[PDB]
Design a protein around this ligand. Structure first.
Ligand SMILES: Nc1nc2c(ncn2[C@@H]2O[C@H](COP(=O)(O)OP(=O)(O)O)[C@@H](O)[C@H]2O)c(=O)[nH]1
Lengths: 430, 51
């Protein structure tokens, strides 16, 4: 019941899903040939959330993989647990978008999206009770930033009542692997703010910073970043698949975390995480979990959360623990940091507890925080956009394929208005 | 002197020596982050160096 399907596009989406499904598979105890070998009975009661049953007793993810080039999918076919994907869901182009939003959103993406829309419609009709959709992309690639957001728009046009989650990797200037990052980022955000029910940003700079200082490991890798992202992803939906004292579905999170419909951009955090050296040295307690939770450095984003005030916060605990301790710790933190919490809405922290901890850990914590400190990323992205747009740089490709600079002006105006109206509530007083 | 004069060889006697006790500290189990070689640096030394 209340199951969701996974849809991933582009190299980043495919590789993120590659280990998200690996983490889910390890949590549910499924073998790479589709044969269940778990130990607990609770591992099978809610397996229908992410797995469909097939003849012979095997399970298949409801995952749809799309790209305008087939190399990334032919490579993810090689990774561990890559033999679980249903081959028909692989949809690939023959040309590639070349990091061009126009190519990925107007000519080639519009023509290609027909088959993937057909299969997505088939998957959505097949399920017993649809809960929503989760879509993972990065804003640094043209094919992703165009095709993913166009599919978000198309899916929203057909399912207005369902919920939509977007896992957005925004390009920050510190980890700048492309010069056309802000054109595509602004053009993707302009469409995303209109249609995405929820969006949560992830920064590779933050990932690497976490890897060097928190885990203190010398050689961070794409695998480590993907593993952290996948753990954070599973922390949100663990409570929907496992019993707990206070269940809270994604719809309840949407109700309790979004005050105004256009303010649905989040930053997250996962606890506990420590080096191998301090694993035995440390002790797992609720105060330690919450102090590592609410540390400004622990955030999954490069934005500084002490530069603004939290609009709302959501907590998902995993493991068997007393609720009174959790409530008193949250009350203590909210009293001790009253300067960093908005005052006209009292009790802006939501709590959820699940009795099933992750495999290998006794206690776990997922934080999702909607705060005004996220304005810095948008401000710097808009600054880079206006710098590169003032001299009409690299716009010949975009203007030669059907779209003009009026759309750029509208996107910049909308993004600036979004930033202004997001910071407006920061200075609001009762 | 005891060998020739007393026709008696003297056999020296050994002694029990001091044995110090030493404690063993086991390597913590793999949590699931990073890699073995990179992650073991933290427990091996305070300042981690590339494996
Ligand atoms: N977590 C993670 N992020 C990645 C990896 N490779 C690239 N990225 C991020 O993805 C963004 C680039 O996406 P891109 O490959 O151009 O997307 P595409 O055009 O759809 O294939 C950059 O901001 C990178 O930081 C990876 O292996 N792991």
């Amino acid at each position: 019941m209340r199951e969701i399907v996974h849809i991933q596009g582009g190299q980043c989406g495919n590789q993120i899903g590659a280990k998200f499904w690996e983490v889910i598979s390890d949590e549910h105890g499924i073998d790479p040939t589709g044969t269940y070998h778990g130990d607990s009975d609770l591992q099978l009661e809610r397996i229908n959330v992410y797995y469909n049953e097939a003849t012979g007793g095997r399970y298949v993810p409801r995952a749809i993989l799309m790209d305008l080039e087939p190399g990334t999918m032919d490579s993810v076919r090689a990774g561990p647990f890559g033999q679980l994907f249903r081959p028909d869901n692989f949809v690939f182009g023959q040309t590639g978008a070349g990091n061009n939003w126009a190519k990925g959103h107007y000519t080639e993406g519009a023509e290609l999206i027909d088959s993937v829309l057909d299969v997505v419609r088939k998957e959505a009709e097949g399920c017993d009770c649809l809960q929503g959709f989760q879509i993972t992309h990065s804003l640094g690639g043209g094919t992703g930033s165009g095709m993913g957001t166009l599919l978000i728009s198309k899916v929203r046009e057909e399912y207005p009542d369902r919920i939509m989650e977007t896992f957005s990797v925004v390009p920050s200037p510190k980890v700048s692997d492309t010069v056309v990052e802000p054109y595509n980022a602004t053009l993707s955000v302009h469409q995303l703010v209109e249609n995405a029910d929820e969006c949560m940003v992830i920064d590779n700079e933050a990932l690497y910073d976490i890897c060097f200082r928190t885990l203190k490991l010398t050689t961070p890798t794409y695998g480590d970043l993907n593993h952290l992202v996948s753990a954070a992803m599973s922390g949100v939906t663990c409570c929907l698949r496992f019993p707990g004292q206070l269940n809270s579905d994604l719809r309840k999170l949407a109700v309790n975390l979004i005050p105004f419909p256009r303010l649905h951009f989040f930053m997250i955090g996962f606890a506990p995480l420590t080096s191998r050296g301090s694993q035995q040295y440390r002790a797992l307690t609720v105060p330690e979990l919450t102090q590592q939770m609410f540390d400004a450095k622990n955030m999954m984003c490069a934005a500084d959360p002490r530069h603004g005030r939290y609009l709302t916060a959501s907590a998902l605990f995993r493991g068997r623990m007393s609720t009174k301790e959790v409530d008193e710790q949250m009350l203590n933190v909210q009293n001790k940091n009253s300067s960093y919490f908005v005052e006209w809405i009292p009790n802006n922290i939501k709590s959820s507890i699940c009795d099933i901890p992750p495999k290998g850990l006794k206690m776990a914590v997922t934080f999702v925080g909607n705060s005004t400190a996220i304005q810095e990323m948008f401000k710097r992205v808009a600054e880079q956009f206006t710098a590169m747009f003032r001299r009409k740089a690299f716009l010949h490709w975009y203007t030669g394929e059907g779209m003009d600079e009026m759309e750029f002006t509208e996107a910049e105006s909308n993004m600036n208005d979004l930033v202004s109206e997001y910071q407006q509530y920061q200075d609001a007083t009762a | 002197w005891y060998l020739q004069n007393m026709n008696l060889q003297q056999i020296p006697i050994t002694l029990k020596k001091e044995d110090i006790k030493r404690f063993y500290q086991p390597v913590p189990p793999y949590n699931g982050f990073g890699s073995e070689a990179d992650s073991l640096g933290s427990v091996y030394n305070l300042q981690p160096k590339a494996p």
